[PDB]
Amino acid sequence: NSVPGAPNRVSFAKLREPLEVPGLLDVQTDSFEWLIGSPRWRESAAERGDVNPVGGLEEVLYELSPIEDFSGSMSLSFSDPRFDDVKAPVDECKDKDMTYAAPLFVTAEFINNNTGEIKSQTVFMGDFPMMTEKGTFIINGTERVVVSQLVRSPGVYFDETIDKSTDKTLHSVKVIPSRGAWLEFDVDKRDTVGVRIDRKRRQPVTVLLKALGWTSEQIVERFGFSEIMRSTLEKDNTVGTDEALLDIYRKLRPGEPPTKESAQTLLENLFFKEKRYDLARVGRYKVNKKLGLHVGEPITSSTLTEEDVVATIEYLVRLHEGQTTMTVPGGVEVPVETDDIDHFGNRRLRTVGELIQNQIRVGMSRMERVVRERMTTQDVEAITPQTLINIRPVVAAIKEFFGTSQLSQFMDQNNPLSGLTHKRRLSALGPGGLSRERAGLEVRDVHPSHYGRMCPIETPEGPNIGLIGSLSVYARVNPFGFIETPYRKVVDGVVSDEIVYLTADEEDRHVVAQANSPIDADGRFVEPRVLVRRKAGEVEYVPSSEVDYMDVSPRQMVSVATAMIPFLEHDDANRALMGANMQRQAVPLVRSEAPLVGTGMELRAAIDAGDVVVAEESGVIEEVSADYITVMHDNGTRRTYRMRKFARSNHGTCANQCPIVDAGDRVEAGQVIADGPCTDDGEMALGKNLLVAIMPWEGHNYEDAIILSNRLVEEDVLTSIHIEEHEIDARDTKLGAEEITRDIPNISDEVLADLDERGIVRIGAEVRDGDILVGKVTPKGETELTPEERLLRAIFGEKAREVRDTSLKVPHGESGKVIGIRVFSREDEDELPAGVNELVRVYVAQKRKISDGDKLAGRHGNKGVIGKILPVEDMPFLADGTPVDIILNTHGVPRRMNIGQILETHLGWCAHSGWKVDAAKGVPDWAARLPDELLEAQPNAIVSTPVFDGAQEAELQGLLSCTLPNRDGDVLVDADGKAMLFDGRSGEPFPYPVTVGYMYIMKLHHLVDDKIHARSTGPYSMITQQPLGGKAQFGGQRFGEMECWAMQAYGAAYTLQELLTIKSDDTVGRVKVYEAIVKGENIPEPGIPESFKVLLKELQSLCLNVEVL
Amino acid sequence: PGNRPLKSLSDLLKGKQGRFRQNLLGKRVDYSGRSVIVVGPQLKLHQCG
Amino acid sequence: TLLQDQLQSVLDTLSEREAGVVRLRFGLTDGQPRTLDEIGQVYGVTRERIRQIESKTMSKLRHPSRSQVLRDYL
Amino acid sequence: VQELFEARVPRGKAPIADVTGRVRLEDGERFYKITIVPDDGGEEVVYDKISKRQRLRVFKERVLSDGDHVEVGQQLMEGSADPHEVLRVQGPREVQIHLVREVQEVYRAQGVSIHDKHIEVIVRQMLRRVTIIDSGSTEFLPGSLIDRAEFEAENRRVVAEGGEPAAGRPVLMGITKASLATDSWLSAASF
DSSP states (O other): OOSTTOOOOOOOOOSOOSSOOOOGGGGTHHHHTTSSOOHHHHHHHHHSSOSSOOOTTHHHHHHHOSEEOTTOSEEEEEEEEEEOOOSSOHHHHHHTTOOOEEEEEEEEEEEESSSOOOEEEEEEEEEEEOOOTTSOEEETTEEEEEOEEEEEOSEEEEEEEEOTTTOOEEEEEEEEOSSSOOBOOBOOSSSSOBOOBTTSSOOOHHHHHHHTTOOHHHHHHHTOSSOHHHHHHHTTOOOSSHHHHHHHHHHHSOSSOOOSIIIIITGGGTTSOTTTSOOOTTHHHHHHHHHTSSOSSOOOOOSOOHHHHHHHHHHHHHHTTOOSEEEETTEEEEEOOOOOSSSTTSEEEEOHHHHHHHHHHHHHHHHSTTTSSTTTSSOTTSOOHHHHOOOHHHHHHHHHHHTTOTTEEEOOOSSHHHHHHHTTEEESBSTTSBOSSSSOTTSSSOOTTOTTTBOSSOOOSSTTTTTEEEBOSSOEEOSSSOEEEEEEEEETTEEEEEEEEEOSHHHHTSOBOOSSOOBOSSSBBSSSEEEOBOTTSOOOEEETTTOOEEESSTTSSSOTTGGGOTTGGGSOHHHHHHHHHSSTTBOOBSSOOOOSEEOTTTHHHHTTTTOSEEOOSOEEEEEEOSSEEEEEESSSOEEEEEOOOSOBOSSSOBOOOEEOOOSSOBOOTTOEEEEOSSBSSSSBOOSEEEEEEOOOOTTSSOSSOEEEETHHHHTTSSOEEEEEEEEEEEOBOSSSBOEEOSOOSSOOSSSSTTBOTTSSBOTTOOBOTTOEEEOEEEEOOOOOOOHHHHHHHTTTTOOOOSEEOOOEEOOSSOOBOEEEEEEEEGGGTOOOSTTOSEEEEEEEEEEEOOOTTOEEEOTTSOEEEEEEEEOTTSSOBOTTSOBOSEEOOSTTSGGGTOTHHHHHHHHHHHHHHOOBOOOSSSOOGGGSSSOSSOSBOOSSOOEEOOSSSSOOHHHHHHHSSOOOOSSSSOOOSOTTSEEOOBOTTTOSBOSSOEEEEEEEEEEBSOOHHHHOEEESSOOBOSSSOSBOOOSSSOOOEEEOSHHHHHHHHHTOHHHHHHHHSTTTTOHHHHHHHHHHHHHTOOOOOOOOOGGGTTHHHHHHTTTOOOOOO | OOSOOOOOSGGGTSGGGSSTTTTTSOEEESSEEEOOOOOOTTSOTTOOO | OHHHHHHHHHHTTSOHHHHHHHHHHHTOSSSSOOOHHHHHHHHTOOHHHHHHHHHHHHHHHTSHHHHHHHTTTO | OHHHHTTOOOSSBOOBOOSSEEEEEOOOSSSOOEEEEESSOSOOEEEOOOOTTSOBOOOOOOSOOTTOOBOSSOBOBSSBOOHHHHHHHHOHHHHHHHHHHHHHHHHHTTTOOOOHHHHHHHHTTTSOEEEEEEOTTTTOOTTOEEEHHHHHHHHTOOOSSSOOOOEEEEEOOOHHHHHHSOSOHHHHHTO
């Protein structure tokens, strides 16, 4: 639907979709799209209001310029930031390990005050990383992604608390700007106020107010209504402006002689000097909105004007009096209520744009205080604009952000959906925000405002639940950073089509309708009443007159990864969350078959994932080949697409790609041309459809274990590809320079039958565990060999050498062909790190079959390892002779409340056999509603079932009584949906009909080849003699504490001591036991370790004489 | 360098890094491995794959 | 250690003199080498009467049987 | 369970009877007033404020009311009684049963079985020490905790030499505080 060449996936839905899904990747591209300032965003935020737009960079320069020294004799100004064209295209930048950027130019001008000059000079600011078409960045060849961050928005926050002593209500306020000072207006258990600005112990409201230039009469005039401040003024003890101004200054410093500076300069240099205290363009808006200030205004400023303060002051006193509304001279009346910190109306989302703008600003705040410092001590009249601009700090800051920053993460891409959902993520943790251990379980809970903005289902299971969430489908980011959602406004019970994006603030004030309401052909609520969501957040019920807004469609709450689970409204939240988190972990198979029964988010989430080569302009195919395709547009110029074949992903998967068109086909703009890793015909296909039964089979699938058939191994139905990358480097050492050469110290000649004449192996060599990949050799140095060895070299006429055999050998348990070999050299201009003459990398491919130990999983969160793989001949086979493929257990279905995975098992069979409603005289009651043209479907037909609007419990049962016979008229699955299986092992049939169907399962990326480990004796750390391993090093297992407790509970002293002494640290013990073992003698009885003759020395180093008696 | 306190002699005994707290915090050992597990419904009670 | 013991075993199969000759030449038992004439000092011979014997013994060791057990330690 | 083993004072404090006799209940301003008249009789014991949120207990006649005969350690209000008071009032052997029952009931409430010998092995480590209230004649500082065995074997060294009356009372102490003070210098140095 609304896609040129998409497949025809029948749908079970009943409602319409007035609004179609947005540009899922918009939150990254159209969000970036504001630092550069491309005309695209110009028109976007110029047609929908936005009187005057200013780019992300321009908004920095226009706050930096004009550079002015303290002498006031000269000035520097910046303007017109523009970008050139990129140097190297994406692909090349991904291959040569060079960062994908473009040049940045800013017009700079210096002017003198004595006489003045008009020197304008285009200053090159440096390289700037650009955002690829998919929304990711390329840094040093690695594809990284920036993740938006949730942060409470600067502004005014009120609140109230109860004291246990007297049990009254104390109403506090706070004003939190970006890079400023905080001043809570507390209201103590007693009176009167909590003026304690900048956290200095307190102050009285009349002090700061009067010090602002207020007569003691005006205070009682405005704020007397409102008598609680009468006591504040009475007990203030101070009369006059400076009489309390110098007291404020005292409490601030303290301990310094008061003056006229310490009285007025301070106050005017903490709130009204827009260089040390400035609340960003957002705060200046959240404050006006909260209070009833200039709100109707193009207003643009960052100084906390006196007025605002006074307002909030009385606001506070009005709160702890008992009232609802508040007004101010000339201001729009606002309601009085304590704000909530977690409400999605006070929690903005700094996207990838503001994070880069912040880094650019922090850099400018280093490159800025380098001109005005080299502006006085330079030769005046001899300086040119470029002579002052030391750009280096800015590029350094940028590179220090895109690297080593905990918000720039390697794009988790082992399949299209994992990549798509790595973007659109919002993590409340990270820099500038809260932490993971210092944030109580309040920011984790789901708030009734998250409906439509953040999905409540999708979230990690580890110690991050609630801290890392994902955007919804229809949501959209405001120009400030607040998340919006589209509603349809209904006027007088007549549902219209005027879509209106509401934020989180202006949603509670109104009344929101429900998605699935009985509208009758016009927009009239058939029934007299309707469900609603009132301000507070409760679920009320109202008449069909107050309803003004209504959701555009169900599944608004659901994210993208979640909107692909069929029958979601039948699964529990735990299992639904596990299913949503176990899809971004699947692996791309070799065939990539589409799912038989999914939802509408398949076709519309692959073309947006950025791994499906989409025809750009409607043309006609001219030539196709596994390597590339060419389209001949209707207007002359053609265009050649280059599909990437067998490219390694970041997690080791395969990035294959293959055309899906012929040499004559006509194509239109948007249509799919080449499939992706996990796509099929241009739509997500993460796994395969397998015939599954639901019986427990003789104890091989016990407690989540799964058994398979050999067919899935013979017919390459779950075979996957994996490409690993090994790397070695040859540097210069103290004795010389390491050389990568075919020559080697004492070694055989059968371990060189695959290395080319110059070391590195030849492409196509079937390597295995232990073999050699790169021939390296390092200078030995100089030593002196004992007799036994000199009398041995003489015998074998092999004079010794001065090199060590330190090559690059394949790690343990790894095989497969050698695909690619990359080589960089300092002698060949191939830039590399310091002290590195050469650097080689070797890619090894491997086709992994399914094997017991590999984890599998369906969409509904059900998972399990593969325990047994029976031959194809002993497996419960239907009456025809078709063996079931997988055999799931029953005891896992009921107690986990995921009966969803059963419904799709039933439907999965229907859509596999194909039905035809027998309504040739009249549509049966059960199926007189759902669609038309869905009363019959050819065998092996595709279908769809939207998340909360799909098939119905009473419809499957109607689609299960029409299951046309396979070849000879013989219905195999009776009405209830159960077959009569024959026991392939014993021969006779099972005594009860068993449930069978077609389930869509996926092979996760937790294969045993990754987990299996072992270590007999490896390398040990030098400082601490405990075992240690790395890439090609075993590593050693960790015998923790509770294990020692268990050992002691057994009373096994010798085993514990052995695990503690001759296996971890005792160097004289490990070798003395290894020698015994290898010689076949008795293991020496564990004595007292040598780690006890070191405690005595460490004590005696303190003048403590400890003696063993 | 870095305006950090240097570890004195007492720091060889105190804290979770000292000698006293050494053998208690557990330590990784040799002749060990790990792996994923499955069901062995044909194994006896005293066997394992 | 196994290498030392295997050297001892192999050298125990040669003549009564040649064993000590090779030892004192490469300084196995005592620990310090000896010049060509130094060893013969105790055998009443000179440079050649020692060097010829030493060379012939080395050629003997190079035989495949002798080097079969030692070739791997190298 | 953690509050039972830590030997804290239960936030839902419940006052326990101190002397046998009669009981006089008086209402008041939002909590209570309870004066136990000693069966001796003589000096009565007075509990001032038993918040109305903390209702009355029950006892076997019925929901205990005014004028009722309460025994030595019969609980007065519902909630949780602190082990220190029950120890001071009814002896150690009663505090052991109290702790064991309070833990085993919390465990039974979940369908878990733990034989009492485990909880007893754990409790035995709590009632080992005595607090030296009267330093007496032998070097024992007031308010310090000393092991019962040692405190008794030292006063066993009371060969006349001047009557050394080292007076101390048993002390119930949580697991943490009881483990802080050990007899091996390095074992404690490892904390």
